[PDB]
Amino acid sequence: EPPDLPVPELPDFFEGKHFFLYGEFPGDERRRLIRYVTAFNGELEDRMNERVQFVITAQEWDPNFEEALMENPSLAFVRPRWIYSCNEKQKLLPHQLYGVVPQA
């Protein structure tokens, strides 16, 4: 029988915080985002709701974001690159470094 190898302990970068993947993602990004967020212990919401803390979006600023802020003033909007960067560097990077805001 094959030998047992160690179970790698998954890094807890997001500590149970709540994400929602907004809009469309190209190719296999959606699946990749779900894998990383889940792996690093982020809770994925089924839809935009008042528990969401991070909205991950590959699309530019959207009027829906503004409406959402009215019931959840604490919302943060971030590019998928943020999540990919946390994986690459193996740590929690500031989401502000990848934030999404209205185009100046």
């Binding site: 179970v7 998954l10 779900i34 894998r35 889940t38 792996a39």
Partner: protein, 82 residues
């Protein structure tokens, strides 16, 4: 960018239904999904390759258990369903 921190591809090609009522559901889901598995939702149980615990969800699929999840990981492969 380092083999030491790269996530394992263990459950590639597995479409698992993991009943919410499962003991340790949260972590099982985390490690399963982390290691390249796909979860099926309760309305799509018919397309599941594997089903954990409940034998009746989809008898056509392979019956697995928490033991099977850790066994696959430790062996670094898909072992016979247990």
């Amino acid at each position: 960018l380092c083999q030491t921190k790269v996530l394992l591809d263990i459950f590639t090609g597995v479409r698992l239904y993991l009943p919410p009522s499962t003991p340790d559901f949260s972590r099982l889901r985390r490690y399963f999904v982390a290691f390249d598995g796909d979860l099926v939702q309760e309305f799509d149980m018919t397309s599941a390759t594997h089903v954990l615990g409940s034998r009746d969800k989809n008898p056509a699929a392979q019956q697995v258990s928490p033991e099977w999840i850790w066994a696959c990981i430790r062996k670094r492969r898909l072992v016979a369903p247990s």
